[PDB]
């Protein structure tokens, strides 16, 4: 059951096709029903409207700020589901809130919210997938990818940020982890945007620059990153998981890598794949 | 790690 969704953010348009320059979106009506998503971030404001009740903050690691009271967990919550910003529709969010809300969070205290995510996962209805956005990163710490790598081992689809330094995204983490999969981030024109890490260890892009999507207070905001380009793809297989059927955490990796649009970017440069997300979309 |  393939609907539209004229007028919808660039980047969910550049999604269901592998032409740039439409602005609807089109997907499947399952839209990722029947599977969760983890967003481990700021937190995410759950009483937005553009999450239809479908989200609910329930964890925190930073002693008593227990609220997204920064943006940006919430602003990945909506690429990832929302009603008008996202990619999984019908999917199911939750917050794990590991940074504080000037934006910062112990490796100690990610590798906590890793854990309870799977644990937690596990207490949850989601018989189609479990998927995990970590729009988040700093420099490498091997404590880190091996939380990160640990996700990915107990069948969580797990989605993380190249960067936005410029640089190969080797030297940080989650991102250099080989066994989670690494988003970096594209242009509307089809570029690589001029901040996206890059590398051997990134394994796909998706739309990274200008992205519209739910923010604190009750509104929307338009920020450019990576962690922009990342719940486009963890949004993209909580949908292929709740239309095609979970084929594996790394899995779901692969099969994105299949279906992405080949040599269509630019700024990609030697070593660095040059796949560009798609959803399957028939008439794409 | 700081969001991105
Ligand atoms: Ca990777």
Same mark, same amino acid.
């Given at each position: 059951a393939y609907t539209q969704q004229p007028g919808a953010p660039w980047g969910l348009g550049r999604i269901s $096709?592998? %032409? =740039?320059?439409?602005?609807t979106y089109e997907y499947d009506? %399952? &839209?990722? @029903? &029947?599977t969760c998503a983890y967003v481990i971030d700021? &937190?995410?404001?759950?009483? $937005?409207?553009?999450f239809e009740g479908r989200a609910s903050q329930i964890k925190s690691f930073? +002693?008593?700020?227990?609220?997204?009271?920064?943006?940006h967990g919430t602003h990945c919550a909506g690429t990832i589901? %929302?009603?008008?910003? &996202?990619? /999984? =529709?019908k999917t199911k969010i939750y917050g794990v809130k590991? #940074?504080?809300? +000037?934006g910062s969070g112990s490796y100690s205290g990610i590798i906590s919210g890793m854990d309870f995510a799977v644990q937690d996962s596990k207490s949850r209805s989601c018989p189609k997938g479990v998927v995990a956005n970590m729009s988040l990163g700093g420099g490498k710490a091997q404590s880190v990818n091996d939380g990160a790598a640990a996700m990915i081992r107990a069948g969580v689809f797990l989605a993380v940020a190249a960067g936005?330094?410029?640089?190969?995204? /080797?030297?940080y983490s989650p991102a250099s982890e080989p066994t989670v999969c690494t988003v970096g981030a594209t242009t @509307?024109?089809? /570029?690589? @945007? %001029?901040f996206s890490n890059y590398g051997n260890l990134v394994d796909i892009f998706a739309p990274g620059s200008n992205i519209l999507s739910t923010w604190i207070g009750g509104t929307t905001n338009t920020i450019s990153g990576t962690s922009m380009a990342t719940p486009h793809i963890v949004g993209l297989g909580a949908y292929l998981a709740g239309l095609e059927?979970?084929?594996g955490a790394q899995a779901l990796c692969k099969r994105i890598q299949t279906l992405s649009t080949k040599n269509? #970017?630019?700024g990609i440069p030697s070593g660095t794949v040059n796949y560009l997300a798609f959803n399957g979309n028939p008439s794409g | 790690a700081a969001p991105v």
């Open positions: $096709h592998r %032409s =740039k320059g439409s602005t009506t %399952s &839209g990722g @029903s &029947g700021t &937190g995410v404001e759950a009483s $937005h409207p553009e930073i +002693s008593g700020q227990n609220t997204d009271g920064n943006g589901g %929302s009603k008008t910003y &996202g990619v /999984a =529709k590991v #940074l504080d809300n +000037s936005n330094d410029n640089a190969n995204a /080797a030297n @509307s024109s089809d /570029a690589r @945007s %001029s059927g979970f084929p269509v #970017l630019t | -």
